[PDB]
Design a protein around this nucleic acid. Structure first.
Ligand code: MG
Ligand code: MG
Ligand code: MG
Ligand code: MG
Ligand code: MG
Ligand code: MG
Ligand code: MG
Ligand code: MG
Ligand code: MG
Ligand code: MG
Ligand code: MG
Ligand code: MG
Ligand code: MG
Ligand code: MG
Ligand code: MG
Ligand code: MG
Ligand code: MG
Ligand code: MG
Ligand code: MG
Ligand code: MG
Ligand code: MG
Ligand code: MG
Ligand code: MG
Ligand code: MG
Ligand code: MG
Ligand code: MG
Ligand code: MG
Ligand code: MG
Ligand code: MG
Ligand code: MG
Ligand code: MG
Ligand code: MG
Ligand code: MG
Ligand code: MG
Ligand code: MG
Lengths: 70, 116, 155
RNA sequence: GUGGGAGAGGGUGGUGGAAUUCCCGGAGUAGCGGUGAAAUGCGCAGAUACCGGGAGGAACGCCGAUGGCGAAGGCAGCCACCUGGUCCACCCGUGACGCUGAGGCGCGAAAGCGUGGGGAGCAAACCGGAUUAGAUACCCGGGUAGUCCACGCCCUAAACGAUGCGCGCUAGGUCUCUGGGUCUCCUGGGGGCCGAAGCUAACGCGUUAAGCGCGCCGCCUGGGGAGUACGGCCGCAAGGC
């Protein structure tokens, strides 16, 4: 399976406003994806988590979602 | 006396019971059923067969209301949490989609001693 | 059978029909090791069943044993306290054995005086779809479709 | 000193969503709940389930790790402000200014105390239902103090790495966090795992020493009696030394 960073550009991990690329790092639900599927380093993941939370509070990223087909 | 022709179906399954509430597209319920609505009384209500019978009885009451297309919502875990959806699929109601919307907190409340 | 599969005994064919189910039934009629008396019972019953109804005793025997074979039964399984009756299907070999046993036990539970008469009338009733052996079979099947609520305990 | 860096380190104020409970409303019947079975309990004054709205308290899912920070206790949503510790590179400045530390002083999980707030969920005591030979328990239904906040006490613990602090010396291998570098790698500084020499009664330790040495502090001298008695000190008390 593909990891998120593998298929992506040279993007800002500190931009909480870019929903287009921050959406890639959320799961089918609103959960933040682990490092196994994001292909990020520890520091990169630690920054991405805070930026994702920032975007969530701004109503840009979903706090949680609903699972399908279950 | 409603002629709803389409709606949602919520399956609330626990380890002590399974109940199905069939509702309209904007949330108000139409019919419902459970392991106690049908004959079973005690722990027998938590068996997958009771869940199947409850889903089927609720689906037939929905037929009495005139239900054809159904969207499924699932909350909780227990024996027959899936059997309810299987019977609901083969009940004669065209299943639109199945969704698991089990409510999980963000670590807000302290559980009972059983749950720690 | 802890180690092996307990290979099934292959019964000798029959001297009259050439069929193995007849020898198996004759064994089920035998008691105290008297296969001669049991064979005489079964074959005088064959004459009686071929005369009182003008059909071949071969196919009536086969149809009766086929009518008595059940398709489901119950076994007890220990789960969460006291055990429960769990339904399940049957092996063909076990269907054969149970059918023949119910045949003999329902034949000897009959009022008829002579043994061959009991055997013949029991085979007749079982071939028609009624009788005591088919009643026990349908009670075995009625155990199924009743406790089917435990269909998730198949094992 | 300069220039960079990581962080649930601490304090203050703000702020977000999920969930529980409760209240308002809609729609909707006959049960829900609970257990190994059950019963108490709740429900026709309309519950449970579903939908919308409101209130309030407490805690921060995914990220999360075998991770990080702190002297220890301990510290997880997000934002801002105030502030501590620490690491690296440069080789710049002072020029032995160091190490340890009886006493003292400060900090010190939870529970507990006092005054005043707060109160969803949980829940000692307690009230019931079961189970059992009995049930004063485990299991179920309720439920107060408490848990939360402000301020002042309390000074205990398996307060654990059961390993005091500092420095130097003594094979490596492997995973990792964070810096620097001419960036298959090297070089610092933390977190683990194997294992040289050596140590150990053994288990095991082994550059994060329980090895080889040095400095300083604390403590030990058979078990029970007993962390008890008396005395003193501290404390509102419980009680602690
Ligand atoms: Mg139940
Ligand atoms: Mg912090
Ligand atoms: Mg802070
Ligand atoms: Mg209401
Ligand atoms: Mg009432
Ligand atoms: Mg009542
Ligand atoms: Mg009442
Ligand atoms: Mg209130
Ligand atoms: Mg976790
Ligand atoms: Mg700082
Ligand atoms: Mg110099
Ligand atoms: Mg000089
Ligand atoms: Mg010192
Ligand atoms: Mg001191
Ligand atoms: Mg304290
Ligand atoms: Mg406290
Ligand atoms: Mg108090
Ligand atoms: Mg409670
Ligand atoms: Mg009692
Ligand atoms: Mg209780
Ligand atoms: Mg020493
Ligand atoms: Mg580098
Ligand atoms: Mg540390
Ligand atoms: Mg190292
Ligand atoms: Mg190492
Ligand atoms: Mg050695
Ligand atoms: Mg070792
Ligand atoms: Mg050393
Ligand atoms: Mg030693
Ligand atoms: Mg002492
Ligand atoms: Mg002594
Ligand atoms: Mg003591
Ligand atoms: Mg004293
Ligand atoms: Mg005094
Ligand atoms: Mg004491």
């Amino acid at each position: 399976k593909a990891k998120v960073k593998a298929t992506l550009g040279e993007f800002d991990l500190r931009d909480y406003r870019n929903v287009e690329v921050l959406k890639r790092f959320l799961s089918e639900t609103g959960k933040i994806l682990p490092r196994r599927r994001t292909g990020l380093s520890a520091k990169e993941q630690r920054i991405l988590a805070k930026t994702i939370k920032r975007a969530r509070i701004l109503g840009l990223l979903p706090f949680t979602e609903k699972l399908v087909r279950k | 006396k409603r002629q709803v022709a389409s709606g949602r179906a919520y399956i609330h399954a626990s380890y002590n019971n399974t109940i199905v509430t069939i509702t309209d597209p904007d949330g108000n319920p139409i019919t419902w059923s459970s392991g106690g609505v049908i004959g079973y009384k005690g722990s027998r209500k938590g068996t997958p067969y009771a869940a199947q019978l409850a889903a089927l009885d609720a689906a037939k009451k929905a037929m009495a209301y005139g239900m054809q297309s159904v969207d499924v919502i699932v909350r909780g875990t227990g024996a027959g949490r899936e059997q309810a959806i299987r019977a609901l699929q083969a009940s004669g109601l065209q299943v639109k989609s199945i969704v698991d919307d089990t409510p999980v907190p963000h670590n807000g409340c302290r559980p009972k001693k059983k749950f720690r | 059978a802890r180690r092996r599969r307990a290979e099934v005994r292959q019964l000798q064919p029959d001297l009259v029909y050439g069929d193995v189910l007849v020898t198996a039934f004759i064994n089920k009629i035998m008691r105290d090791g008297k296969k001669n008396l049991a064979a005489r019972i079964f074959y005088d019953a064959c004459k009686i069943i071929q005369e009182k109804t003008g059909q071949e005793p071969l196919k009536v025997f086969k149809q009766a044993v086929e009518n008595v074979k059940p398709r489901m039964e119950v076994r007890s399984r220990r789960v969460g306290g006291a055990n429960y009756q769990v339904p399940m299907e049957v092996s063909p070999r076990r269907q054969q054995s149970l059918a023949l046993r119910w045949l003999v036990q329902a034949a000897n539970q009959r009022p008829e005086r002579r043994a061959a008469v009991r055997i013949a009338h029991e085979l007749m009733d079982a071939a028609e779809g009624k009788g005591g052996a088919v009643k026990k079979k349908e009670d075995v099947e009625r155990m199924a479709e009743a406790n089917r609520a435990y269909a998730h305990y198949r094992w």
